[PDB]
Amino acid sequence: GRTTDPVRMYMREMGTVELLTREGEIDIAKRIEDGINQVQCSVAEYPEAITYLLEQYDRVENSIDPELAREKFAELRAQYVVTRDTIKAKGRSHATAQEEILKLSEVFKQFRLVPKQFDYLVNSMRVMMDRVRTQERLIMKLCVEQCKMPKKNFITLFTGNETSDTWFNAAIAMNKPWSEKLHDVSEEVHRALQKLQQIEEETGLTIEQVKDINRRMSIGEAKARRAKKEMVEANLRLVISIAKKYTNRGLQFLDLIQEGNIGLMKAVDKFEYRRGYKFSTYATWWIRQAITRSIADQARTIRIPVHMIETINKLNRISRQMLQEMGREPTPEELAERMLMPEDKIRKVLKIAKEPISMETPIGDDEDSHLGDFIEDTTLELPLDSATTESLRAATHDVLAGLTAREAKVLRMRFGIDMNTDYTLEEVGKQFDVTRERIRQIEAKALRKLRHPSRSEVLRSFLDD
Amino acid sequence: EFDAIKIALASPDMIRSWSFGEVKKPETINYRTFKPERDGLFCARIFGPVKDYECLCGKYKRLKHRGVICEKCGVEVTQTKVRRERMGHIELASPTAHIWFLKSLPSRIGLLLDMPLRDIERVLYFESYVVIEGGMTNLERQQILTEEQYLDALEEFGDEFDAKMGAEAIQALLKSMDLEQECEQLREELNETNSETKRKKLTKRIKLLEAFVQSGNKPEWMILTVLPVLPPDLRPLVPLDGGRFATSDLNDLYRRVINRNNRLKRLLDLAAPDIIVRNEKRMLQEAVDALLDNGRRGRAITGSNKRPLKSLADMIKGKQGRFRQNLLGKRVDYSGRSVITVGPYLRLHQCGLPKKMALELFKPFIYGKLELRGLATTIKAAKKMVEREEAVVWDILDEVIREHPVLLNRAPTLHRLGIQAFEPVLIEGKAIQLHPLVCAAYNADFDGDQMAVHVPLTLEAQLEARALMMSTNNILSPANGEPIIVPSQDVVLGLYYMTRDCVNAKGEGMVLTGPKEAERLYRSGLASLHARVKVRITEYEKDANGELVAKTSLKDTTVGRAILWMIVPKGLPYSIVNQALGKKAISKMLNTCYRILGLKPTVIFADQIMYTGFAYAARSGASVGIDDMVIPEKKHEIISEAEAEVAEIQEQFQSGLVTAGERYNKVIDIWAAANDRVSKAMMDNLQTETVINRDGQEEKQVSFNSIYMMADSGARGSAAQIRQLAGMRGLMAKPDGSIIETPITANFREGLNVLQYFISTHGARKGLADTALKTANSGYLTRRLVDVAQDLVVTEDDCGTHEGIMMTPVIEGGDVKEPLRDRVLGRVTAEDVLKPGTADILVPRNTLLHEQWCDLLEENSVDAVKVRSVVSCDTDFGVCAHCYGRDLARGHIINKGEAIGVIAAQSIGEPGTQLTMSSIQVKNKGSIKLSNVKSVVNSSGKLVITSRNTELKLIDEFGRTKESYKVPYGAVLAKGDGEQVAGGETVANWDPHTMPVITEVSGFVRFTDMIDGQTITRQTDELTGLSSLVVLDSAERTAGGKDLRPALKIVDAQGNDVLIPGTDMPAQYFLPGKAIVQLEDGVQISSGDTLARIPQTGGLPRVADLFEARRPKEPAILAEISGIVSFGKETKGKRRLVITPVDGSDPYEEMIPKWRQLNVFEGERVERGDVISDGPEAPHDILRLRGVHAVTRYIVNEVQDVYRLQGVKINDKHIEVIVRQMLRKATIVNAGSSDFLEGEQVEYSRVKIANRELEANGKVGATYSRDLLGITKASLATESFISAASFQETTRVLTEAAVAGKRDELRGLKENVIVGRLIPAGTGYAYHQDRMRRRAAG
Amino acid sequence: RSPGVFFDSDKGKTHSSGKVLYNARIIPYRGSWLDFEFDPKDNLFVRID
DNA sequence: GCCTTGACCCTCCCCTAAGGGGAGGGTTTAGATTGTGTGCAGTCTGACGCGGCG
Ligand code: 118
Ligand SMILES: [Mg+2]
Ligand SMILES: [Zn+2]
Ligand SMILES: [Zn+2]
Fold first, then answer.
1. What is the CATH topology of the domain spanning B634-765?
2. What does DSSP say about strands B794-796 and B879-880: parallel, antiparallel, or unpaired?
3. Where in this protein does the record say N6-acetyllysine is found (chain B)?
4. Which has the least CB within 10 A, B141, B371, B398, B1062?
5. Is A36 left (phi over 0), alpha (psi -120 to 50) or beta?
6. Which residues pair with B432 in a beta bridge?
7. Rounded distance, CA B576 to CA B597, Å?
8. Partners of B1137 in the beta sheet?
9. Phi and psi (nearest 5°) for B1124?
10. CA–CA separation, B580 and B557 (whole Å)
11. Closest to B867 in 3D by CA, of B821, B831, B903, B837
12. Does B1095 contact A at CB distance below 8 Å?
């Protein structure tokens, strides 16, 4: 396309959308709102396996009268306890049921945007619906291994009848030998189908009404999603016009844009058109919040917490005006007196605001000598020290041979020489069954002999450290 | 231990099995307590502990528990060194493309899928779709779409087809394809379309698919899903003094990847619109590309100081990468440097070393020696004794350095005599003292230079420093076999002043008993050094079987030569000292002393010469004054007599008699002549102008002027510089190259003007600027030569060939420039040559031609010998000792195990800084010989020949060719063959602006083959009235007329074409445009009459172009095969030409532009190789048409043409080594059951040792052709990827070696230098050999 | 180098025919570069930066 | 000499009553505002290989 720049590639794919007018955003928000309540409608007459609000009003048990908070919850359930008495009559799809449960929907429409409370009721069937799905997958991974059979008669009448296994009698009807080529495995089909039939027991309702109105419940959750998408896609110029005042502060342009878009996606989710204000006035807050939060979390090699960021910024703002006013830079005393903090903290803050230098920094007249060439390894031992360590080990091994073997084993155990660990008196006397005190006696013996001048001046040579 | 190195692509499971855990966030370290944050880039749970045997919290310590893993902080208790070995990884949220396998041309993805790079770079930016599956539809695999066409296909076809976008699409394409089926269907469907343009790409794609199938790789691993992370200690974060930190750039580049991958993992959970997820995937791709190779696919990401960040690929490649900076040369311990100065009292094996330098460099030796004598109890007391500088320390130091050699080195090291081993002598002071005779191999002097000192530590290094590198084994040069220790500046002046003579010297006439009496008389004050006397002298010789026989005589000589004779050793003749000696005579002395006596007498004799030269130069008293520069008294008149001429040649321009150009070009030479007159007057007034009188009266002798004495002896100076001191300076050039008109008529003894000085500064700066900007070209050429030649080593003793090359002298360009003796000395004879009779055998036919054999060849006269060469050696992977010949620095047959490639490269490269960057007469009398000839008698009683390529040679008294020319075609030879003519006689006459082309036989000329309206005019010379039908230019062209190119032909009394004796030939030739023909119609001519006529950078660049095998921009055209020539189908893009064998097929005909004047007419019969035009020849054609020896001979002669023009001497096998290395590849023509392809390029040794085994058990082998590659294209085409990767272009080498799946066997010298092993050459050759034997054992 | 306009040519070295090719450059203290040039077939061309 | 008592002694860590001070982390904020920007860098010459268009 004759270009490889991704900022132009973005600003080009972003310009194929039109800006909205004051009525466009209102009637987009209206359908965003009514799809999410069409869903809440569809959740209404699902069986008691849902987490329905019977005692959610009691689970929790603008400051509204307690008598108002206790009473208006009695309207809905006062009609609901008598309404779904008709769950039995004429199957599961009775028309009085649709009429009065969409009258419960007439009641339901009153409400508007809410936290994940509503979410946790539709999840009430998530954990239950896909379950059903996956179980009828199991039957299939138990049929295809043994026999091959055309799927569009079987699964079609599977969708249709759901009364009993009598639809398998529709498999032999065409009189081809693939009818009962299956042998000794159909009880596994009956296994999984029977377990989902006891799932049907706990639900009490057949699958082709639950999935039937889930087909229309999925219409609301998609029709809200699509309107949210085209409410987001029409406002990207706002993000791009805000995020151009945060440049040269540690992030690149497209990073700031992709941080602003995640805030716009929340301003779209929290909007309320009834309050009468435009969309820009509410969205700018979330856009700026996202960009500001990402500048303080990224964009430093060594990360500083947010409270220290605000302290640094405040001290910069004070020193600017004191420099404009005095004509000089103020000493930390003149900053402590006005910032009203203890001077040691003002001295502590002033060290934390420096970014590490690159190891490729050219140092000299040329550019073949770098800063990283003159950096020395500090954790190495000098060879004079290695030789000294080995010579001292040999000298000690020679002096430890003069005195008794049993009387040197105790020194080896007591100072840990040639062993994996140091030991204590009682655990050494464990193997000697000698008293707590005799060990100390023989140690004061050995250490008294070992400094007699017939022996000491070979080891004394080392202690000039 | 290990034996090889492999390279391949890395799967995701391989990258996950190198790692110790996943990096999840950009945290480096805590800002208050600088400890590594968990799961960040410096994490101590993944990468290891930051202190020895400590966890991070502090719970565990003290090396009791060594394998425990702390439960609080997860760090295991171990040593911190492991933070240099452990790696981590990053799991990417969407696959990305590796930039190397996409954008290093040719792209491997576009070559594997057969897609253009534009389509791939459009699918990778979410800018177009691509069809993966066709289903059952009109769309097919790899079809490209746009969004609208994708929507149309969706609403029209639905689910059946499959189209994707981004690197997931490309991974699906690479993953779905089948390689074996595809390559086999490229096999049988190439033979129809095996046209060349398709042939090249089809065979390239075939070998790529076959490489992927055999190597084991999978094509989809070129798309990344897991990323590795380098260990933390190789990209450190380090505190400086002051609390400031410093960091690497890979940290900056890893953080961007991590926190653009995390954001995509967030957006894929918020379920955002796709316009935003696409922007994230693009940003992630760009970030990974900048981490791998920064500036390759766009703009380079820069840091907060506006410099581009360095990447993982910039740390490997280039002049400052790992390879050239840390692996091929290092910094070392036990070494120092200092200023050098001269010590004149030293022996040749000795250097002076300061006491303090030696005390520092030798510290552990002194510690051990101190505590062995019991002088110190422990090493830490020895340290303080040494630090206090007690008196016994200086006595331990003197016996430590006793018999411990020391290596000295001065940069730049142009050849191997730049590092030499000496024995040290402790001195006071701080400068190093160097012997005055080794300053010529070093190129050193004492205007401020500095030298480096190195100490060998082990027993083997000491043995090698004594036996191989000591300065008393290095007296000969390894480029030519000449001595290198010749005396330079004051040895020469002192020896020259002591062996001169003078007239009427004090003490003239006496008769003395020997040299001792002459010395005793000179010291006493009774005689002079220059006095003519008679002395009795005893001298020795050896003709016995190793014994010396003496003889005495009385000789006439001077005192000084009798004094000098006490230095010369026993066995040399007196005639070497009886001259007045100079630099050349002294070099001759040293060389004959080396030839007769040997090495050790030579190294004693050189020292004695140095001492006595210094002593007598001191006693002479030579000085320089202002009166020693004598200006001739008749310069002032030569100057006026040139100025008068330039005035009277200006006034022939002011009156319109001469042009401006000729006026300038005449003033130039009338000033040059006066300059030459002044210079010769000056030099004759100075050279013998001494009138010293004798017993009765005056006479003349050579001068004792100081300047003349130091110029004539060869100590310092020349005539060209005394010319500027005492003559005039001359003519100056502009910076353009133009010469100014008025010259500089002054000299340095008299002083220049402001203007003469100003115009003299131009050339000074031009020279100073050329030097500095030429040194770089010379160094770069040396590096390429070393890289092509580095792995060639003498491997065997005798290969057993009978091939060779024919050595003759070079006699062109004038007199004999190179005798035959200088070109066979040291070589081995290829066949049993015989002195010019018959069966004069001198040979077991393997004969090292040492000096006695060359004398035997020169007492007879033989001028061609067949010798042995390396370009014809039959040994594979090396040369044999007999094809190489003599070791030019040792004087005997080469030893097996020698590194001849590095020596060849260094010898050719070292002198590169001195490179600049109408009728035949006969001199002496001898026979005249002709070759390549075909003759005819003339009408005027002379000889003519109808050969174009003949040769005319002059034969000496005995039959050795002394001069050789070639005559132009059509020329009339003044005299015939077999004549003994004297000098001063012309033998052939040709026109300076014309050459005629003659008839074949006496016949009757007809105007035919041309009409009016043709390329012919009727242009008759109106003043003289002579005109034939004249051939025209293309400006007077009539295109419809050139149907037949005009020529006037010869007929019989039959009216038809004449017989030619021997063959049924057409007697006449058709000539190209603009021919001058004025021969009458109806006026007939004889055989050989004038029918028609023919009207009409050196230095380092040329050497580099010869070794790089460039193609000239006007290459001559040669005959592909032998056959009768004719013009072809005449398709008029430009002219067509064909040749036709008398028996064979002739599909070969090709294009020639009409600007290219042809020299071969339609009746010619040509043989394979001869020219169809003129122009510089191309070496690939010389290798294709003629053999290997022809291109070898051409290259070595054209290279030596440049070196000899400057006075540089290089032997000729040093160029043959390079030519052998440029010929290592072969190309297959017909496989024939040989497991090779039909136009693949293979190594020549592989083909050779395959055919030697196929043909062994009765089978048909392969047929091939040889190739010629330049030095830098043959360095890169070798079969080890480590040498090639460390030479140049590391990216291409590594990507190709990676997808191919190569391995490396570590057989050269550089491979073993990289990994720190013993090289296979020299004292390491035996070791490797033994190892190779175990390769046969297992 | 001063700001202003500079007329230059390559002297028969770029094209194989040995033809000289002229060009002209305008160079400001601050701004962008504008230059005109000739080609083998005698057509004026322009380019920016 | 080769062991057993009964006294004494030391350092290190955790604890008391009623909060105080700070470090480091979470969340929202409703008049409207809808496409970058540096007073860029652009700046060498020669050889070679491949694609795109006549
Ligand atoms: C410079 C420019 C804007 C703000 Sb503000 C703000 C700050 C304090 C009190 C009220 C408003 C802001 C909002 C969110 C995140 C970061 C900064 C602000 C917001 C919307 C419109 C105008 C100003 C601050 C400094
Ligand atoms: Mg010097
Ligand atoms: Zn721990
Ligand atoms: Zn050989």
1. Topoisomerase I; Chain A, domain 4 (1.10.132)
2. parallel
3. 942
4. B1062
5. alpha
6. B340
7. 15
8. B1127, B1150
9. -75, 130
10. 11
11. B831
12. no
What is the distance between the alpha carbons of residues B329 and B783, in angstroms, rounded to a whole number?
A: 14
Q: Where are the alpha helices (DSSP H) in B727-850?
A: 754-789, 821-824
- Centre of ligand 1 to C-alpha A285, Å, is 7
A348 touches strand D (CB under 7 A): no
What's the CATH number for A4-61+64-298? 1.10.601.10
Question: What tokens appear for A208 in the block?
Answer: 């082709």
State both tokens at A171: 């498999």
* φ/ψ of residue B772, rounded to 5: -65, -30
CA B290 – CA B297 distance, rounded (Å)? 8
The token pair at A25 is 């955003």
Q: How far is CA B54 from each of CA A378, B39, B62, B78, rounded to the nearest angstrom?
A: 18, 19, 7, 7
Among B171, B170, B231, CA closest to B12 = B171
Under 8 Å between Cβ of B16 and B89: yes
Q: Topology of domain A380-461, per CATH?
A: Arc Repressor Mutant, subunit A (1.10.10)
Please judge whether A387 and B379 are an interchain contact, meaning their C-beta atoms are less than 8 angstroms apart. Answer: yes
d(CA A76, CA A56) in angstroms, rounded, equals 13
Q: Which two tokens stand for residue A150?
A: 């055309």
Of A residues 223-252, those with CB within 7 angstroms of nucleic strand D are 234-238, 240-241, 244, 247
Q: What are the beta bridge partners of residue B433?
A: B341, B352
Checking DSSP bridges between strand B245-247 and strand A357-358, what pairing results, if any? Answer: parallel
Residue written as token pair 């004594």? B466
Contacts of C29 (CB under 8 A, 6+ apart): C3
Of B405, B371, B600, B609, nearest to B498 (Cα)?
B609
Closest CA to B1030 of B1095, B965, B1105, B1113: B1095
- Window A425-444, strand D contacts by Cβ < 7 Å: 433-438, 441
Distance separating alpha carbons of residues B28 and B30, to the nearest angstrom: 7
Distance CA A401, CA B66 (A): 30
Fold of B919-994: OB fold (Dihydrolipoamide Acetyltransferase, E2P) (2.40.50)
Q: Is B183 annotated as a binding residue?
A: no
Please count the other Cβ atoms lying within 10 Å of the Cβ belonging to residue B996. Answer: 20
Dihedral sign, CA of A401, A406, A409, A414?
negative
Q: Residue B1335 corresponds to which tokens in the numbers above?
A: 């390769």
Alpha helices of B499-581 — where are they, by DSSP H? Answer: 515-524, 559-564
Nucleotides of strand D under 7 angstroms from a protein beta carbon? 3-6, 23-25, 28-37, 39-42, 47-48, 50-52
Domain boundaries, chain A: 4-61+64-298, 299-379, 380-461
Give the Cβ contact number of residue A36 at 10 Å.
Answer: 21
> A448 beta carbon < 7 A from strand D?
no
Show me where chain C is broken: residue before each gap, C-N > 2.5 A.
none
Q: Residue A226 is which amino acid?
A: R
Write the DSSP symbol of residue A45.
T
Q: What's the reported resolution, in angstroms, to a tenth?
A: 2.5
Using CB atoms within 10 Å of the CB of residue B1139, give its burial: 0 to 12 exposed, 13 to 18 middle, 19+ buried.
buried
In this complex, the residue of A9, A261, A357 whose CB is nearest that of residue B276 is A261
Q: Are B1108 and B1272 in contact (CB under 8 A)?
A: yes
Q: How far apart are the first and last CA of chain B?
A: 14
Assign domain A299-379 to its CATH architecture. Answer: Orthogonal Bundle (1.10)
Q: Measured from the CB, is A112 under 7 Å from any atom of strand D?
A: no
The three-state secondary structure class of A210 is: helix
Chain interruptions in chain A, by residue before each (C–N > 2.5 Å): 61
Which burial class, exposed, middle or buried, applies to B424 when counting CB atoms under 10 A from its CB (0-12, 13-18, 19+)? buried
Please give the structure tokens belonging to residue B360. Answer: 């520092």
- Rounded CA-CA distance B435/B897 in Å is 32
Supply φ then ψ for residue B137, to 5 degrees: -160, 180
